[PDB]
Design a protein around this ligand. Structure first.
Ligand SMILES: [Ca+2]
Ligand SMILES: [Ca+2]
Lengths: 708, 708
């Protein structure tokens, strides 16, 4: 050194352009045409928004989709004359726009539009007006841009001044066939992009449950919040036109780390200083509270993270759906074995058995090509915003090609070995001997990833998409996929009579008793004497066990060629003080055969069916018209439920609202009437939840038809 | 309640649980009591010598995985193979579990077994038994706690907590079954055991070198590298994977907010910390990080690389620092770097905003890549200086250098970005008055033209350009580019009159005049007229320009089939008083051919050669005896220097220290003498730097033989 003074900007000549909200001031000066006014034909009934499928947003600015032409008109001081005039529209985004970064976009006047390029074609010249058909690149950056008109002269460039009224959002475009996010099915487009109401699947594989969720991607403020989310990630504006990077970054913002992303994750069941995850009714109040407070919102769990992320994708224009995997091996570290340790007597060792499978776990799928991959891997891409340990740390996983997962090609980014293990792991039943050695007893290859579902395109029904992640157990394709996976990230760390045991557990209403029966088939011609053990645990929906509420031992003598069934009754009083939110229960039935020391082992989950909220309506059901909605909850339980928060939602019918009733005494009903004034017409939906100081994960809804 | 998981993440080596000394169970006592344990852990003895761990300034036992070491257990009476069952235990974290690798029961075995933990009784004598214990070559790397446990029928008895037997287990380059296996002694010595490096800087025509203390064996460094992982909350089950250690560790090197080791800064001022130029090695950086528990100010790429290289060789991963001359950093995986040209042929500096780095340093870490197809093991590139990648602004790699060389850039991690860093082209583009842009020419040979690293057994430079890229303009290179462009590499713009141009710039001492000479080759039969421009910028080493200090333009007439030279004089006074630290200059020579409108363009950088420090020594140069070091610096400049900090360093010879001189007048010398008592014998180095309020990037060194 040897100095000229003042701090220098030596790392880069221009600061990162990583915020849509920030802006520069473009010079208005850098006889000649002069712009007197601009018309974007942006009313929601007009051609541009209707043809660009953007008429739903509650937003009065123009919003179009990339890769597709839209119409503008510029009025000038005198008629435009091609013999001496040169002008172009410009679109500009961020504080440091640059043409080579895609963030300063001069749109050239062309004779004909070209596939793939930005261009504006003069389709009409009338008096002093010119009408343009403007096409954007199908790879354009997605965000809110500033529009300008520039007039080129001999002395330099004159430009219009800043005008917020012409700010134009450009979004991804599932209808545009050259856009990465091209989805060639109108019906799929409506469901995965334009439907603002979802269903989540929960409960357990043998007692599926179904709750409704407001994505609300068209509601006021939501689109702007999705841009804000990217700004808070400091996402480079130049990567916001890549649906892969968009999904990679935005998903990383869903779970809050410190005081940085959108939702604080918590499964502690009490939720002191926030709002239970179970209470949420959709993404709207969460996203708006994030943007409003500028801090993480408390609190979420996997379906909440998935609800919000699904809103983010849909709103920006990437087709997205929520998936529910039944028996989910999360926190896998890419191992394909989950260990259950037994004692020598055949009891579960609860000291060692510490890995749990989730009764269900939700994540996201986002549709896009994968031009970075060998051909064949585009389509749905699994993205799970609920973090687990991957190659980098405790983070989100994905985007991972579902097809690549299905084929074992888990070397292709991102985090595919982790999502592969989430649905393909085996249960391994291991005896931990009293000398400290370990012996493998048998392996259960059919429990994890048993069924995988998502909402149907038609209606509220369940679609089964198990076969999209995995081939059929037993056949060549499934074997080829495991063999490949084991080469590229999947691990199997442990290397891997005539008695069948199973068991069935009755589904019941919360507070009711239920039956369980155990069944033995001895096909052999020999006699067996078995000691079988029943262990029945309160658990979170994650599988995490809180308490053994019921233990039992059966002594069985098996005759040759026999079938033997054994029945027991669990009373309500054996679990009723003890249940966690979601009310799930987990059963082990494990048995050692005395003659052979063979292990038979089986597990099953159950949830108690919890009470629904009743919703009803009267009055006329008309956009711009008052209807009255009644929210009804009848406590059927003998505690007095305390601080009973009730939440009402339904996109286009009401914003999200909540009410608390200080207590609901045994068997009483509360009611809460709200006058709503729908703003969206057609088949809509009122949505409610309740959480009290104890009892929660209570839902209700009502379908309503709205006229206008 | 923790419903997210049954046991918290085991992600800190500093955390620990208590093992029960008696963990009985059952019905209802002299089974064998250990009276003491001996680890033969002295630095002259065979465990540390044969494990190559005897250089660590650390009185605990330190071994390398997958290799045997000896221990002695003295019992209260003679071990008795008839009736006794016992085992060594190794345990790490607060939540150790056997199936995660963090509780490790070591079985007494009849013979050691390759790839498995075991201990052989190799001696019995009086009450003492001697063991040979082999760790798995996949073992977690960390500081373990050691227990001995005795099985009774009722459960176990166990030694109590004893810090003196805490055992470090590191990666093992000498073990043929370790992922980090490096098959020869000369490379092991250099990339693992050598604690002094050389850093290559300057510019491709003028390679500068300076020494850097890795200091991986100095007191406290090993524990610091484990504390780095603990501040990353790195799962303990990932710390035996050298791919994940590299991936997580390098992410910790650049500080983001108040997390990470070094705050990056390129502002030439460095208020409130220490100039990146002033560090002499890693040791005081890492120890300051550890004691303050906060980021250290400040670093730039070679400093990040120096500290990362320490972290790697300290845990046992072979590692070296590479310098790439003309580096395209912040590439976004684009292979095209733009220069914008006015219509007359001058550079448009308003639009030209991307800069090539004169040099850029990163690291290579040696390991297998079993996550990748075969052939991609070996050197992996890891650049802890951030740029935009698939995820955000982060470190890049590890990326297999072989995968980069062949263009297979779909294979993790961040390979497209490292690929573009060495393979980008310069694209000269005219930006016309009417807003349109015209491509003139592409220079495919400026970026990545030389990549270098320290030689084995000397301070000389090894050219390793060939490890990253095939021969220019030949089939292998062309395939590799084609492959790259289909798996993440991008080339956004689609790409003579027989005149050639190049130029040369004399290298000069700071304060001296120097010449530049431009030559034009007319290979045609035509006579041409040219206007040529020369713009000479004061830059940072990253290529970010601060000011144009010189600007000639001139007319040339080229005769057919001929040369014409044009020489330019640059006098000292034209740059002096405007330089930035590293005293980098950059030169453009652009020329427009009048007759054809063709463009010639070329660029060069030089650096002024800056004054070396003088280091002298006297006295006995013997381990444990005093010697006097003399460090002198003469201010060569004609200005006065203010707040001159001089640093002294030399692993095994002295800790890092510094001394400030308030001012040094023109051509005046300051003198620092330090009494050092060396703790390491053999060929050593003393290393010095100087940084002032102006002048910095000033170094010296002296090699010294220290006698046993
Ligand atoms: Ca399976
Ligand atoms: Ca090249």
């Amino acid at each position: 050194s040897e100095t000229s003074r003042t701090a220098f900007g030596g790392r880069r000549a221009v600061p990162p352009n990583n915020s849509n909200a920030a802006e520069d001031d473009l010079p208005t000066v850098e006889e000649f045409l002069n712009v007197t006014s601009v018309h974007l034909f942006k009313e929601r009934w007009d051609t541009n928004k209707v043809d660009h499928h953007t008429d739903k947003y509650e937003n009065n600015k123009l919003i179009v989709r990339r890769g597709q032409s839209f119409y503008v008109q510029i009025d000038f001081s005198r008629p435009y004359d091609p013999r001496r005039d040169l002008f172009r529209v410009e679109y500009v985004i961020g504080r440091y726009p640059q043409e080579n970064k895609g963030t300063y976009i001069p749109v050239p006047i062309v004779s004909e539009l070209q596939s793939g390029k930005w261009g504006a074609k003069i389709v009409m010249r009338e008096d002093r007006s010119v009408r343009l058909s403007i096409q954007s690149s199908p790879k354009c950056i997605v965000g809110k841009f500033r529009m300008y008109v520039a007039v080129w002269t001999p002395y330099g460039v004159l430009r219009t001044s800043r005008n917020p009224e012409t700010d134009t959002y450009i979004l991804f475009n599932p209808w545009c066939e050259d856009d990465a996010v091209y989805l060639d099915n109108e019906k799929e487009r409506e469901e995965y992009v334009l439907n603002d109401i979802g269903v989540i699947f929960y409960g357990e594989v043998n007692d599926i449950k179904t709750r409704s969720w407001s994505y609300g991607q068209f509601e006021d403020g939501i689109l702007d919040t999705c841009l804000y989310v990217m700004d808070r990630a400091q996402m480079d504006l130049s990567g916001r036109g890549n649906p892969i990077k968009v999904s990679r970054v935005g998903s990383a913002m869903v779970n809050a780390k410190d005081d940085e992303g959108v939702l604080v994750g918590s499964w502690d069941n009490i939720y002191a200083y926030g709002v239970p995850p179970s209470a949420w009714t959709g993404s709207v109040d969460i996203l708006l509270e994030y943007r409003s407070s500028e801090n993480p919102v408390r609190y979420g769990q996997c379906w909440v993270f998935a609800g919000v992320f699904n809103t983010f994708l849909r709103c920006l224009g990437i087709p997205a759906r929520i998936v529910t995997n039944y028996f989910s091996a999360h926190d896998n570290d890419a191992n394909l074995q989950m260990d259950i340790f037994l004692e020598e007597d055949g009891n579960v060792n609860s000291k060692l058995t510490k890995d749990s499978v989730w009764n269900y776990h939700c994540w996201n799928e986002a549709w896009m090509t994968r031009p970075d991959l060998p051909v064949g891997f585009g389509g749905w891409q699994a993205v799970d915003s609920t973090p687990q340990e991957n190659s980098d740390g405790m983070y989100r996983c994905g985007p991972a090609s579902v097809q690549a997962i299905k084929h074992g090609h888990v070397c292709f980014q991102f985090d595919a070995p982790f999502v592969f293990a989430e649905v393909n792991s085996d249960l391994i039943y291991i005896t931990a001997k009293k000398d400290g050695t370990h012996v493998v007893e048998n392996v259960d290859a059919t429990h994890i990833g048993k069924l995988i579902v998502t909402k149907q395109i038609g209606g509220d029904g369940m679609m089964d998409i198990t076969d999209t992640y995995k081939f059929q157990e037993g056949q060549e394709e499934e074997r080829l996929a495991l063999e490949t996976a084991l080469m590229y990230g999947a691990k199997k760390p442990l290397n891997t009579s005539n008695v069948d045991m199973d068991f069935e557990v009755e589904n019941a209403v919360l507070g009711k008793d239920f039956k369980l029966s155990i069944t033995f088939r001895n096909n052999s011609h020999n006699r067996y004497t078995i000691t079988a053990y029943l262990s029945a645990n309160i658990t979170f929906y994650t599988g995490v066990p809180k308490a053994e509420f019921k233990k039992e031992t059966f002594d069985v003598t098996l005759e040759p060629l026999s079938f033997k069934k054994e029945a027991v009754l669990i009373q309500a009083g054996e679990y009723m003080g003890q249940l966690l939110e979601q009310a799930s229960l987990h059963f082990f039935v494990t048995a050692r055969i005395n003659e052979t020391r063979d292990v038979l082992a089986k597990q099953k989950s159950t949830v108690l069916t919890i009470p629904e909220i009743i919703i009803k309506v009267r009055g006329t059901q008309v956009v711009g018209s008052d209807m009255t909605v009644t929210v009804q909850f009848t406590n059927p339980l003998k505690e007095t439920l305390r601080n009973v928060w009730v939440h009402l939602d339904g996109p286009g019918v009401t914003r999200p609202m909540k009410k608390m009733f200080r207590e609901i005494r045994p068997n009483s009903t509360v009611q809460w009437e709200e006058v709503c004034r729908p703003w969206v017409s057609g088949h809509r939906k009122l949505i409610a939840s309740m959480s009290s100081d104890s009892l929660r994960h209570v839902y209700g809804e009502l379908d309503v038809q709205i006229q206008r």
